[PDB]
Amino acid sequence: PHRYRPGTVALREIRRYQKSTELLIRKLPFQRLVREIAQDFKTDLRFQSSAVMALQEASEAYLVALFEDTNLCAIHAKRVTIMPKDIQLARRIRGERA
Template sequence: MPIAGRKSISKKTKRRVSDTQSHDQSIDENEPPEQGTSNLTAKKAPRKDAAGKKNRGSDAAQEKRKSHRYRPGTVALRQIRQYQKSTDLLMRKLPFARLVREIAMDFATATESGVALRWQSSALLALQESAEAYLVHMFEDTNLCAIHAKRVTIMKRDMALARRIRGGPFASDIL
């Protein structure tokens, strides 16, 4: 019996094909043929399921591919714009309130009044607003001092110079 698509098949091959068909009607397509024989009647093995197949290089590509990094200063400039737009407080309220109460307790024990201090939430909020405004203004002046020294990084001496130029009650207590 001639096989379509083949021009010449040796007698030996024809015999093997006929022997295979008569002895084993169900050919296991996943099993490779024995050495020296060609399994002409066997169809192509079906593709493996998606569950058994590895993703083509996606794991390797993710490991090799670096996460996106912005250039130095880009994120800082974005944060500056974000904080300049916002009007909310930058420090957390509870830690600031604990600090204020601790300092107030130190003053209360120094005077030996022995009275427990109570704070209104609006008083704590007013103190926090004032403290943040002072710090922002201080950092603005410190940045100007650093720029005057032809630097972009603020240093301790810039802050000391800003406090000294400003004057005020604590100008002599330079860091």
Template sequence: MQPKHKTAIRPPGGSTGGKKRPAGKSVKSLKAPKGTQKRRRYRPGTVALREIRRYQKTTELLIRKLPFQRLCREICDNLGQTMRWQASALQALQEAAEDYLVDLFADTNLCAIHAKRITIQPKDMQLARRLRGDPMH
């Protein structure tokens, strides 16, 4: 019976073909300077889970106020109406819009999980909206 693993044989001269160091330099002198360290690299998904936990704890708005305000005014202008907005009305509209979107994305995620996927797709959002009874355009 032959052995399962072969051992590596060193070529004559002792070199294994690894990284070449400049002559006279030790391993310690090739490392990065003491003040600069390599940035920590987290495994895929770790940062995403941390962000999920962070945003679940907060009650602050996720969409910036001015871009949302511009969007509301633009939609009103496209309808052919020039309206004046109270700050409290824009605030209430943004709260309702963000609440709707967070719930929609939660339902969309459930649809993706039901399909044995972890990535949401447009068809998941369409299914979630259809199951909710939202009008489809």
């Protein structure tokens, strides 16, 4: 057998997804979530196809940027593992949490 060490494949994946631009959440599951959430606000809603895609472009852009900030908080704590308290500190400082 041949096994890359812990961290090696992780760094390859970082280089990989930082190199490309395709969406990383599956298309249909994301569409279901949008419709589920939208339904609870108001019933009998339809969505332009581009409206859902816009919501996905925005959501992934948002989440990626947050993980960057989350990563900085972990490293600030001399860890390399991201944790909920890292996300929480980040959103607090961004003014999303307070």
